[PDB]
Amino acid sequence: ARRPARCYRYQKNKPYPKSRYNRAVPDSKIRIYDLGKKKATVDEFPLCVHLVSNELEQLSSEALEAARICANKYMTTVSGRDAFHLRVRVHPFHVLRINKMLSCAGADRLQQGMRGAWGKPHGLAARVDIGQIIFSVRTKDSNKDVVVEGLRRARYKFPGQQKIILSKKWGFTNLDRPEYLKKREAGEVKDDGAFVKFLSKKGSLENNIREFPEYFAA
Amino acid sequence: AKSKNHTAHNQTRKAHRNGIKKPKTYKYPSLKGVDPKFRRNHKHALHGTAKALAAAKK
Amino acid sequence: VNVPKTRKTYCKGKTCRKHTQHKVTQYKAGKASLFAQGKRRYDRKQSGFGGQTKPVFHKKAKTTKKVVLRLECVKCKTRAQLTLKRCKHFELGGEKKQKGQAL
Amino acid sequence: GKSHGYRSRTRYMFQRDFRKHGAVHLSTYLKVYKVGDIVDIKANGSIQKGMPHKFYQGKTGVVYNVTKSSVGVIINKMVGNRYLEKRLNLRVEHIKHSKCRQEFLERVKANAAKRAEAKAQGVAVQLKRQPAQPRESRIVSTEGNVPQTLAPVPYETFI
Amino acid sequence: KVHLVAIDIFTGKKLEDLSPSTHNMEVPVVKRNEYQLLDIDDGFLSLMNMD
RNA sequence: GGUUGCGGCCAUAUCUACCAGAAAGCACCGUUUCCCGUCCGAUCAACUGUAGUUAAGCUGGUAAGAGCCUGACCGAGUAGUGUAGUGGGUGACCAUACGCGAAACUCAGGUGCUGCAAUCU
RNA sequence: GCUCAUGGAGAACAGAAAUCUCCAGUAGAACAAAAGGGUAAAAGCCCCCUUGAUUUUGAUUUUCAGUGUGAAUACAAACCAUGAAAGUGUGGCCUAUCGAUCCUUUAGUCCCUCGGAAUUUGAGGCUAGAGGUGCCAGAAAAGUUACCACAGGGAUAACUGGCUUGUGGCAGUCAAGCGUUCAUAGCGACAUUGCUUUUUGAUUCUUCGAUGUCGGCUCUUCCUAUCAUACCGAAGCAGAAUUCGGUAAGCGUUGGAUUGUUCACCCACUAAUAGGGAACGUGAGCUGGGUUUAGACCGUCGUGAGACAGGUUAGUUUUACCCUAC
RNA sequence: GUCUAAUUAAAACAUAGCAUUGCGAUGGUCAGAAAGUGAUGUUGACGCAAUGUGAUUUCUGCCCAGUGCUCUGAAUGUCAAAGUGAAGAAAUUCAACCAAGCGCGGGUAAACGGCGGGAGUAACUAUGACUCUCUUAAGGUAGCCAAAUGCCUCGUCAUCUAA
RNA sequence: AGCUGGUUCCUGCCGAAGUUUCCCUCAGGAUAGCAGAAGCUCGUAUCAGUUUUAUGAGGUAAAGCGAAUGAUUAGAGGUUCCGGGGUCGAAAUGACCUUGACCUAUUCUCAAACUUUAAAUAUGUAAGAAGUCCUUGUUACUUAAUUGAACGUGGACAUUUGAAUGAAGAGCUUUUAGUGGGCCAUUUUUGGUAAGCAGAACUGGCGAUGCGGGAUGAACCGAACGUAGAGUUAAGGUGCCGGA
RNA sequence: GGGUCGUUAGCUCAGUUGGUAGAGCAGUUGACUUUUAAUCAAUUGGUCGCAGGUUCGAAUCCUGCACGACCCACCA
RNA sequence: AGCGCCGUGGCGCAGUGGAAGCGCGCAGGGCUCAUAACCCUGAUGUCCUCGGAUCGAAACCGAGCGGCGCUACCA
RNA sequence: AUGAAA
Ligand SMILES: C[C@@H]1C[C@@H]([C@H](O)CC2CC(=O)NC(=O)C2)C(=O)[C@@H](C)C1
């Protein structure tokens, strides 16, 4: 019962976020941003795959939600709920206004039209660009074609020409594979619950040796 | 029946026709707005120097 | 608002020309004399047929008047006016504002 | 309603600075100002007395008058089709000098020095400034400086 | 235009008027004040304030 | 060079944790009759410079220190932007030509200087 | 002279929150308010003294016509306060908090005039303020008209047309699921891309020195997003019956009941009883039910005259002999 | 029976009948520039004047708080001019007094017109005789209806119809 | 009658505005601007819709949020005299387990009314004669002070008298018309689903403007007009209509 | 033809906006009585109309799916 | 669709920044053979939810939820 | 004022 995304697609107008000025919004339907085995670790999922955009547009929580479900459905169906971690990477903070006219025949006598154009909120949306990733996933090469099938379905749900990319990176890091590996057979790394903390060459040697001990025991 | 509320269109053409003449700057400007103490002393000093020059060439 | 009953202020009185003490009092607009030229002209202007002849004012907005004082020098009695802001409540008998007190 | 005040659309303009809030240093006061001095105008929002208008923020003028803690300044202001002379009773916290004028005076006395030396020897000063003239020939060698051939780079995605 | 009906309060007497919705109509500055009660003489209410 | 007083710029000067401190100077410190102020000679006023201590303040050094500052032949001639085009594209947008040109990041360095006067082995 | 918010650690009653004490505390508080700037031996809190919220008039800035009003800025000559003093101080830390003429009135000057000369009341003057115009550069002011009039207006509405197409309608992509089992025979949620202008909005370009304004009747022609009929393909098509889909608009798509009706709903036949366009086709072609003047009735609203896409009833439908088309 | 001649002949007007109101002639209603003027009136309450409603039959409920009309005056309310007093040299000012009217208080609905909401409850459930409460000047009584008054509404049931 | 309509010969020269402020002001006026005419003082400059050098000011783009404020995703590691509790047990600031808080550093995403930073473009000012230096005259101002300030005497400092370029004369006044419904395009941009929509910013145009191309068209591209001739081009094109 | 609201024990009604269905009526039993009635206590009953994500996890989040209850629907 | 009102005990209705009123209903006692009525007594109100300002709110200003009302004309 | 059925 909603208006079309073609009506609310482009960045025709500046960011209208939630604030102390609006104060009153219709909450999203998306609430999840991470799926799969998010508590997996870095060496556990080495491969990282992306879904990006070649447009410059607004994307609704509804499309984000349906696409999330389609990809996660495929993966959790075929390779199980704990063979991957999916992570969305765009949050809808933008808000969409509508000057709600009537849906009758006889509104003429009380419509009043464009006097009072400033519309009330009726949803949210994201704001993406070239290359700003929409989705990312971390898993293994065995799970590769499975996950890119999921991304294919999510493309079919989002508008525009979105692309898939298999990164040169180890998990969700900004690090490439062999550098990660030399570091990790070395000892500059220290795993967190999901992500990892690195060793600086700066600062407190005492804290570094409190941490990262094997690197000192080279 | 609304109307065109405002526009600065064509005003700069109108100005730069015969426009933005710098104000004619002058030697010996106004001593209005100047500290009146200074005005007063300046008066008496000029009286003195006029007298002095006339006495040097009388 | 509140004001005292006496004030040290300049008295341009031709022998003080300086600050003396001045008893303050309010200014009352003063009863209107008949036989003033406006009233005389007005009685003539309204005299007879023709109805009302001068306007008469109803579109009122101000819920306040400017308050105004009289300042009588104790020595010279050279009175003097000076006007203040607009105030809903006004007072000269000043029970001071004691800060260190309860509700 | 439409709001057009003395200190309207001025927020970031009279924002004092970062890590420079509080008081003012003292050269602002120990500086000197005379008739004919050219001066810059930036406003110190920490001094709410003697201020200029935001038009005169970041502007330049000449002195005409001097008082206890303040200075007269003349400015020219476009009003329709003319420049109007406008007189401001400003504070020195908002004033400062024009180093352009200072350097001009230094150039002046140096020009005079050159004229003195050329009165001493008759040696063709050429006082005037001249632009960055186009440059003259030369011979660049190659020893230890052979030309490395370069060429473009292929397209890598870099993700 | 507005028909207005209000009760005069010191009497209990109805007052019906009507006047356009955009013309100005007067309002007083009424305020109520609490007061304590002392020994009542003839009709003058024997009251007091804290001060 | 050190110290004190008055200072300019007001973090290379700050913050944290420790180490040291010849002399002199500051300081800590001792006292309450006197002017003075306090709930209180703690603060402040006054007296001695005696009793004593450099522990603290203060000064400096250390820290793969946090912070700050500078520089980069680091990122990046990227992002953005001015002008031109009967340029491309469905369009969003983009490339090209003449031009200007960031910030973040990455790495390297530095951690108060200095004026007037007086004084100290 | 002090330094706030907050947090931590303590002290009986006393707890999360009562008062006191220590540490950190760049402001995370407070400054009458709206918001924003500004402020840390202060502009904040406390304490002391005061009345510069004073007088004279001018200059300057803002709005700006460089007019006024309002507010503010910096000085001169005075009188003052406060402080040890520098100094600061002409209302509020800055940004808003307000008002001409005529009249009336008050303060000042104790000055001018009252015109044959005087005195005294009274009146009128000059300088400066108030009493107020908020439609805030400032008239003194209730309605209706369907009995209506006029000057004009496409600068401005109601039809049609035009751009747009949210909404209305139509068709696609993808496929979680349904379908006994199986996503796709057939349907296809969540999401998404398009089309059309047959709705309804939005807009106001044309049209107000008039484009005759709903429907029906009549009558032709056109589109197809094909209801039927011709030929075909697919099926969860055994046959019959049915559903989906293609070329296809050649041909046809009713009679009636009620309603002004479009539409809707029923009856019945039917091979089938599909949707729409042509100035929402068509009034010098009809009719005039309806709408849409004037009469009149009811209800509700109104003090009332009078109002009501609220209901009912009654209410003049002009001319072709010209050109074109036929 | 009469009307909108020249777009409306009707449910509209009238009508008889019902009811109300004023008036005893020094008057009621109305007229007129006035006037030794006039119409009703060559008249006299079974009459003149002004209203409403509309044959007959039956019946006309509750509200006088509001607005009007009207009756009190017993009143420190308000209270003009003329008139009185005091002050003043006079202009003049002030005070007192004070007509009607208004105000105050009564009456009046075949005068204008008005005539409510909310909760709970019955041995199936539903419903609510009953009860409670806020409030009004009093809360629509008899009686009548989707009627020319009823949005929703093509109201629900029946009948008339094949529909 | 602030409204409609009409307003009579030729040519030449110049040539607009639909914007500001006030008005019971919104179909109108006053004012300022735009434009004409009369000229006036002087004679190449007290200029410039421009650049450079130097100096300032801005707080928009972009960027950041492991930097402030505000919002936000997920983990891990901890403090429980510490919120909820589940257990061992009598309970114990006793022990254990779990769970929302808070702390720590990490991570993903953002801001027209957030920001350290911070452009491009636009914008102010200076680039000398009314100046620089030296000396000393004035004053009731200022200074402790013949100290300073302001204005000056006298003298010196020229051809490069203080960067570039151009200047078709520079400057100055008076008076007055018409106008005060505006529109289109590029780029920025607010409202709106959107609009040949409404509305602002810069510039250029149409109006008021024809010619050549876009078949066709108010505005686009090219170029702006006395009468003619000769050539060369623009934009656009060269199958035929159509010159190639 | 849409826009909304809701479909909870045999009946009715809260429900909790997420983790547990609670109240009433009814019924069965019990108490009561000489036995009944009413009255008191106790259990009975609950996928809350069909699939989705799923808060670890779901009636209640909300997506659709059959029932109803309202508000709207030429025109001149 | 736009605008306005209101949410207070079990029910109804008052309530005004220093902090909740009344009646009826409820409970207890007494009279009565028992229940009524009656007499003596007491209690009960997250003031629709969230947030804010305030030294402090039912009140005062935003957000939402609900029950209603008013608008809806010229075509 | 009322006082359940046999
Ligand atoms: C309003 C009230 C009166 C008003 C003034 O009399 C109004 C009008 C009088 C008139 O008829 N013509 C005018 O010029 C002004 C005045 O001065 C105010 C302060 C006080």
Ligand SMILES: [Zn+2]
């Ligand atoms: Zn005096």
